[PDB]
Design a protein around this ligand. Structure first.
Ligand SMILES: O=C1C=C(c2cccc(O)c2)S(=O)(=O)N1
Ligand SMILES: [Mg+2]
Length: 297
């Protein structure tokens, strides 16, 4: 059981060892397409690639490659697409992927600039009157509105397939206070944000998989998805004790390498799930408490 395990690990001060064991046991599958010469400029980081078996293929005969993986959680019955922060030449591909996969939401866990360098291209419009056109994939993107909170912003975007003139509403959830290789300010802030995403319908089965990204699409993104899946699993049978967090993380790592980048992100993942469990088990008022403690206003 996670809370007792949490205490055992904290007491023995062995998060580093627990975390390293997960890395040792993590799946290793080929990433041949990602490593092809023609795709070198479609990858942000040399050591972070999508496995071939779970990579998202763009529906174009040209080059179907994008650094994105489909994490399909069978038991939990939820899917997520984890991808890297778009590069200046892959913003059209990113939106092509959102369209073809029928995604309703995009969860961004990083800032365009972190630690003095560019971690992601400005792939969405910052002003209503300045829409963006991705000519390579023939897609149009317009900012419809935005709701800025203290540590996250929610934007409503309109994505249009210029070929058919079909349009869709895309919700953008931008967590702005999560440091690279770091952890959220508190389980509260993180949980308040995850539940904001959930309440929007973006994670629902009627839509395609939500697109989740940070800079590499494995650390913060992994932490976000692990927490969500674990909470959904204990929701399925109202049995928090049946959920094995390490087991769930290992299952997710069969779909994309390096999910959860530090021992403290793993430790934070446990904290988020244990605190989130109060809501799952019937204490509805805890959601208001998180909102309060997160200081979003
Ligand atoms: O906490 C993190 C660390 C990342 C990271 C960034 C660059 C290389 C890498 O291996 C991990 S992320 O953008 O996937 N989230
Ligand atoms: Mg204005």
């Amino acid at each position: 059981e996670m809370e007792k395990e949490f205490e055992q690990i904290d007491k023995s001060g062995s998060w580093a060892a627990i975390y390293q064991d997960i890395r040792h046991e993590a799946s290793d599958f080929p990433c041949r397409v990602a490593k092809l010469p023609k795709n070198k400029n479609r990858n942000r980081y040399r050591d972070v690639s999508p496995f071939d078996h779970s990579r998202i293929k763009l529906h174009q005969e040209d080059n179907d490659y994008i650094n994105a993986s489909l994490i399909k959680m069978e038991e939990a019955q939820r899917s997520y697409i984890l991808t890297q922060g778009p590069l200046p030449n892959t913003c059209g591909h990113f939106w092509e992927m959102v369209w073809e996969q029928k995604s309703r939401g995009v969860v961004m866990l990083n800032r365009v600039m972190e630690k003095g360098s560019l971690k992601c291209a400005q792939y969405w419009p910052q002003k209503e009157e300045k829409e963006m056109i991705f000519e390579d994939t023939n897609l149009k993107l317009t900012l419809i509105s935005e709701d800025i909170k203290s540590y996250y912003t929610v934007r409503q975007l309109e994505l249009e397939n210029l070929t058919t003139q079909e349009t869709r509403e895309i919700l953008h959830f931008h967590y702005t206070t999560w440091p690279d290789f770091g952890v959220p300010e508190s389980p509260a802030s993180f949980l308040n944000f995850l539940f904001k995403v959930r309440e929007s319908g973006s994670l629902s089965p009627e839509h395609g998989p939500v697109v989740v990204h940070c800079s590499a699409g494995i650390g913060r993104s992994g932490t976000f998805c692990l927490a969500d899946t674990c909470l959904l699993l204990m929701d399925k049978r109202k049995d928090p004790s049946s959920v094995d967090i390490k087991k769930v993380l290992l299952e997710m790592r069969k779909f994309r390498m390096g999910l959860i980048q530090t021992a403290d992100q793993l430790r934070f993942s446990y904290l988020a799930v244990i605190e989130g469990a109060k809501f799952i088990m019937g204490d509805s008022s805890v959601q208001d408490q998180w909102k309060e403690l997160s200081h979003e206003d």
